[PDB]
Amino acid sequence: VGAXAXVXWXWXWXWX
């Protein structure tokens, strides 16, 4: 759990 790539908050694909 922390910063980098995966799922959660930030930039990428999903919901706005």
- Least CB distance to Cs ion at residue 6 (A): 4
Of 1-16, binders to a copy of itself (CB under 8 A) are 1-16
Smallest distance from the beta carbon of 7 to Cs ion, in angstroms?
Answer: 6
Residue given tokens 């980098």 in the structure block: 4
CB of 7 to a copy of itself, least distance (A): 5
DSSP state, 1?
-
What is the per-residue binding string for Cs ion in 1-16, x denoting contact by CB under 5 A?
---x-x-x-x-x-x-x
Q: Position of tokens 């930039």?
A: 11
CB burial of 1-16 (b: ≥16 within 10 Å; e: otherwise) equals: eeeeeeeeeeeeeeee
